[PDB]
Structures are given as C-alpha cells and as structure tokens.
GROMACS .gro file of N, CA and C in nm:
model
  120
    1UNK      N    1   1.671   2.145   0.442
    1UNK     CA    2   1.659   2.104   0.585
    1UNK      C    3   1.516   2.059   0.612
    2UNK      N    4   1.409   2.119   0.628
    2UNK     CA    5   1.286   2.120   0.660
    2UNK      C    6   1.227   1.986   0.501
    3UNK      N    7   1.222   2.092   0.387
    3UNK     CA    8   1.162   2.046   0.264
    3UNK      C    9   1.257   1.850   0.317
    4UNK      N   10   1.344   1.864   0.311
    4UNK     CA   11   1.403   1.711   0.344
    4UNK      C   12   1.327   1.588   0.406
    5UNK      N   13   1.273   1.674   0.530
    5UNK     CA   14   1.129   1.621   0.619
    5UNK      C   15   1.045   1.581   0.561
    6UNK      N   16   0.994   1.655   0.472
    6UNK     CA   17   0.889   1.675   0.403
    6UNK      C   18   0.866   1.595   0.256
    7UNK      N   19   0.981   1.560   0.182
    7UNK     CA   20   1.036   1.485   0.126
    7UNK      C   21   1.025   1.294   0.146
    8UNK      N   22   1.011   1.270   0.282
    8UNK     CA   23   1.057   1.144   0.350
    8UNK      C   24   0.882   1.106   0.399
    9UNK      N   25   0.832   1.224   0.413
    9UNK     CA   26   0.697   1.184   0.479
    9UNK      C   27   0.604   1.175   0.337
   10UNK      N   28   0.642   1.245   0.246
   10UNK     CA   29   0.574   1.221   0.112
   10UNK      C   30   0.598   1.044   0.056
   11UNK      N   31   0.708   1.047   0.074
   11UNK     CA   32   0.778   0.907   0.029
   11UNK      C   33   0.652   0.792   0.143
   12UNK      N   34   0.663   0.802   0.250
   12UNK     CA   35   0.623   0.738   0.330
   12UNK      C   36   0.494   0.715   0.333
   13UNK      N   37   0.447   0.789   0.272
   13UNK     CA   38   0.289   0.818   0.256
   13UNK      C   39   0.246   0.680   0.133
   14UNK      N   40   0.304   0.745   0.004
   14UNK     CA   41   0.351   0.686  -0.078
   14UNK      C   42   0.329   0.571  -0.116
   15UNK      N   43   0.404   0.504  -0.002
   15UNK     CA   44   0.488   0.378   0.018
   15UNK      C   45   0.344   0.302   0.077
   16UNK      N   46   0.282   0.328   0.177
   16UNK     CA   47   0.112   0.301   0.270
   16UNK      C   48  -0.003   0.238   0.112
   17UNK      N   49   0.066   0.335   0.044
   17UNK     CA   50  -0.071   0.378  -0.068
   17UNK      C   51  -0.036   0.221  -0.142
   18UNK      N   52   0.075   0.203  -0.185
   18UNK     CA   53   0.103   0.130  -0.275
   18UNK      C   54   0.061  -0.036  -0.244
   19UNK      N   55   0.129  -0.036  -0.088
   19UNK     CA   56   0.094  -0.167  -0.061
   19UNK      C   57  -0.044  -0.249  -0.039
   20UNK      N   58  -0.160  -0.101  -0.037
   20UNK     CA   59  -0.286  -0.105  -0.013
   20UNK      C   60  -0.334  -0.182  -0.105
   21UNK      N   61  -0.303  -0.089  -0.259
   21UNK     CA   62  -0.344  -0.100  -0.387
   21UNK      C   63  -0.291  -0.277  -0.399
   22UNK      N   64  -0.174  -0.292  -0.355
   22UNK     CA   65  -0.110  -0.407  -0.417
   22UNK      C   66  -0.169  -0.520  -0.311
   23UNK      N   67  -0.229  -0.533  -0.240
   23UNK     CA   68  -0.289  -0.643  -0.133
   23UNK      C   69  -0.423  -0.588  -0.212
   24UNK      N   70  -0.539  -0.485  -0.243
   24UNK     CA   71  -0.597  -0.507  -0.293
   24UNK      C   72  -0.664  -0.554  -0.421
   25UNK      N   73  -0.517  -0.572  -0.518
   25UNK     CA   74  -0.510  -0.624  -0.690
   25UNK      C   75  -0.563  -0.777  -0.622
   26UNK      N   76  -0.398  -0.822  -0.503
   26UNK     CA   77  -0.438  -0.972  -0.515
   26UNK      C   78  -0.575  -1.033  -0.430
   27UNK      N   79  -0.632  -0.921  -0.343
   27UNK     CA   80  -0.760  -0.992  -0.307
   27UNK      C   81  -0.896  -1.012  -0.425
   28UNK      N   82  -0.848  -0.959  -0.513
   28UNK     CA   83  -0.966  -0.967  -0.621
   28UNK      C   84  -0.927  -1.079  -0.734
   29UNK      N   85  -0.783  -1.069  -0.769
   29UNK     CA   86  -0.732  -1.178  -0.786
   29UNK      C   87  -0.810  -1.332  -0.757
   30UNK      N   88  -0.813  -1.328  -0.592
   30UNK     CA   89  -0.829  -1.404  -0.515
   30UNK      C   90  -0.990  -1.495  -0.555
   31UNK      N   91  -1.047  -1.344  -0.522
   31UNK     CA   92  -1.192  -1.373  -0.567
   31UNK      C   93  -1.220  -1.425  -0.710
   32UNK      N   94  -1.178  -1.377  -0.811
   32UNK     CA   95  -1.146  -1.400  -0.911
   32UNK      C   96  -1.128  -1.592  -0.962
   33UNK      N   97  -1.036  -1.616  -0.927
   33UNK     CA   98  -0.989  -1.760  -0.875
   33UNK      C   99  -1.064  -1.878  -0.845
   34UNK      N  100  -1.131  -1.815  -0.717
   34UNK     CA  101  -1.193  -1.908  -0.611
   34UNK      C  102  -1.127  -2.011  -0.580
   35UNK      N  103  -0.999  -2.006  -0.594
   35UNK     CA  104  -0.956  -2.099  -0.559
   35UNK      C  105  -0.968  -2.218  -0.427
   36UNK      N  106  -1.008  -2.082  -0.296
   36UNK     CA  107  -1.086  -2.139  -0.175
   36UNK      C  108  -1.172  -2.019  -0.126
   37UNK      N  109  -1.228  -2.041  -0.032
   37UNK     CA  110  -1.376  -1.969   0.028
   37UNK      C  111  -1.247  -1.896   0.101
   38UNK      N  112  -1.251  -1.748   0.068
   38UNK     CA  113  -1.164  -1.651   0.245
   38UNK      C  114  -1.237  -1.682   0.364
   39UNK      N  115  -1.134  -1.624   0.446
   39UNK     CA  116  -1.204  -1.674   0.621
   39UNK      C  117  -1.293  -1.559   0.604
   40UNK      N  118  -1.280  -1.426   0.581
   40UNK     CA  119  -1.384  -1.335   0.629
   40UNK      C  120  -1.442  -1.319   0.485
   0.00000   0.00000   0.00000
C-alpha cells in the first residue's frame, strides 16, 4: 500500500535524473560539433 507510493516516487525521481543526463550528453555533443554558436 504505502511502499507502492514510494515505489512510483522513486521511479519518478528516476525518470527527472535521466532526462537531465540525456539533454546534458547532447549539449556537449553540441559543443563538441560546433555546428552553430547556442543562443545562451
């Protein structure tokens, strides 16, 4: 019941972390490249 909660917010957490990591592979990528100057 509870652990279930607890379960979903781990997942969710998780899930924050990954997409961080994965927008930060391709901004270095990016840099990497140079393909163009970023806005910031």
């Amino acid at each position: 019941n509870w652990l279930w909660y607890i379960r979903i917010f781990i997942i969710i957490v998780g899930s924050l972390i990954g997409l961080r990591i994965v927008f930060a592979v391709l901004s270095l990528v990016n840099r990497v490249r140079q393909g163009y100057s970023p806005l910031s």
